[PDB]
């Protein structure tokens, strides 16, 4: 039958910025999670609440695949119960997370001579995010009591900021492509199963 189109997610050309991260629903297919572990060399493949060796034996209502790009020293924030700019302001996993996160170094794809300034993250925000929330706002962040009126200045700062992804950067500061697999088990029929 139909194979789950993991090539479209993992092998995409353009990846979303972390603040405007990207969800892809997966349904009506059979996934070979064993092959996914050995499909390549991933620098990270932490599973949560499931063993990927025995994930091929379960069925789920639907599977959500979230993908984006972050720094190397921020991949550790893509885990339950984390803190930091990426976890608090960009992409937040729940404490009861039941899925695997996956990452690999993408200096070959997402860094540029003189600086790649197309990859952005959220710097300022009024509050931390709820799990799986996504804020793509762009309004000037009011830090004082004076209203900003859509104009940058003192105490009026633009909410987003860009990685200066350079090829000669250290691997901690290099771009990494994260892909998070969420598994949902509801009262409905299950359309995504192993072999």
């Amino acid at each position, epitope marked *: 039958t139909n194979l789950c189109p993991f090539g479209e997610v993992f092998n995409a050309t353009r990846f979303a910025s972390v603040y405007a991260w990207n969800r892809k629903r997966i349904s009506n297919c059979v996934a070979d999670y064993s092959v996914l572990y050995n499909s390549a060399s991933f620098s990270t493949f932490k599973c949560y609440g499931v063993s990927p060796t025995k994930l091929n034996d379960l069925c789920f209502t639907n599977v959500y695949a979230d993908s984006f790009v972050i720094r190397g020293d921020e991949v550790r924030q893509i885990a339950p119960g984390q803190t930091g700019k990426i976890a608090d302001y960009n992409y937040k996993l729940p404490d009861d997370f039941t899925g695997c996160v996956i990452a690999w170094n993408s200096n070959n794809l997402d860094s540029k001579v*003189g600086g790649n300034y*197309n990859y952005l993250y959220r710097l300022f925000r009024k509050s931390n995010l709820k799990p799986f929330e996504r804020d793509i706002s762009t309004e000037i962040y009011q830090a004082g009591s004076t209203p900003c009126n859509g104009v940058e200045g003192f105490n009026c700062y633009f909410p987003l900021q860009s990685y200066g992804f350079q090829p000669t950067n250290g691997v901690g500061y290099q771009p990494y492509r994260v892909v998070v697999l969420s598994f949902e088990l509801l009262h409905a029929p299950a359309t995504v199963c192993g072999p």
Partner: antibody, heavy 131, light 113 residues
Framework: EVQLVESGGGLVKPGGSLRLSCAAS????????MSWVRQAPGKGLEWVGR??????????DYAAPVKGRFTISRDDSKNTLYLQMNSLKTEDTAVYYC??????????????????????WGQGTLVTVSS | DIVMTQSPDSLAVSLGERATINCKSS????????????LAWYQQKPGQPPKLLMY???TRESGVPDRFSGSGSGAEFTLTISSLQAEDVAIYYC????????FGGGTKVEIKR
């Protein structure tokens, strides 16, 4: 070698039409936002029009003096950039460049440049519009 | 259109003297999302295609000598050759890539001798 080779210019009567083309080699063409820039003799540079890569929509943009008459297109299977000029005017008399300028700040290519460079221009094809 | 305008039109100094060029945009070309000025400088000699010199306002292209230094921010930019050499006689255009592509009027730099 990465190289841009324009061709297809010369003398054309006003109100007429003419197709410029530019053959590229040495890089992954299909990932670059190519533009045409022209230069009237003794005058400055003037951007004519860009076309984005297929990955980024393929959307075209033209400058006002030529918008409505010019048409840019790709043949990624042959690594060629085209410029269709119709209803030609004498103020279109210029040498026309195909160029990768303006692209590397947006496109998808990474740091592995074949020669450490990203900004490239052809030698240039002159078009004379005259009765 | 965003409109580039350079001053002066021509420039003449002795060998090793300081040459400066100015560029003014209609709107600002500072992108808030990354705090980057989206403009460049090109050099062109007669019969040649232009050569990129500066980008992101100040980032030198590889091979460009240290005499060249881009500066400015927002809508006012300056290109400065610190000690003009005999092989810098050319016309220097400033280009914006903030919205499509637009070139300035160029500035002719000549050697007093």
């Amino acid at each position: 070698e990465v190289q841009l080779v324009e061709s297809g210019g010369g003398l054309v009567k006003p109100g007429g039409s003419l197709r410029l083309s530019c053959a590229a080699s040495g890089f992954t063409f299909r990932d670059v936002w190519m533009s045409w820039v022209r230069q009237a003799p003794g005058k400055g540079l003037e951007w004519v029009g860009r076309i984005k890569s297929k990955i980024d929509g393929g959307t075209t943009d033209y400058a006002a003096p030529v918008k409505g008459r010019f048409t840019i297109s790709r043949d990624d299977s042959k690594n060629t950039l085209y410029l269709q000029m119709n209803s030609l005017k004498t103020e279109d008399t210029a040498v026309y460049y195909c160029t990768t300028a303006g692209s590397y700040y947006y496109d998808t290519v990474g740091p592995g440049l074949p020669e450490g460079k990203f900004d490239y221009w052809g030698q240039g094809t002159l078009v004379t519009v005259s009765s | 259109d965003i409109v580039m305008t350079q001053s002066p039109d021509s420039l003449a100094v002795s060998l090793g003297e300081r040459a400066t060029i100015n560029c003014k945009s209609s709107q600002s070309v500072l992108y808030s999302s990354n705090n980057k000025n989206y403009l460049a400088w090109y050099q062109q000699k007669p019969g040649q295609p232009p050569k990129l010199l500066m980008y992101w306002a100040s980032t030198r292209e590889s091979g460009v000598p240290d005499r060249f230094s881009g500066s400015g921010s927002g809508a006012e930019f300056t290109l400065t050759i610190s000690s003009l050499q005999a092989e810098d006689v050319a016309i220097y255009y400033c280009q914006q890539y903030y919205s499509t592509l637009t070139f300035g009027g160029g500035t002719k730099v000549e050697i007093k001798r």
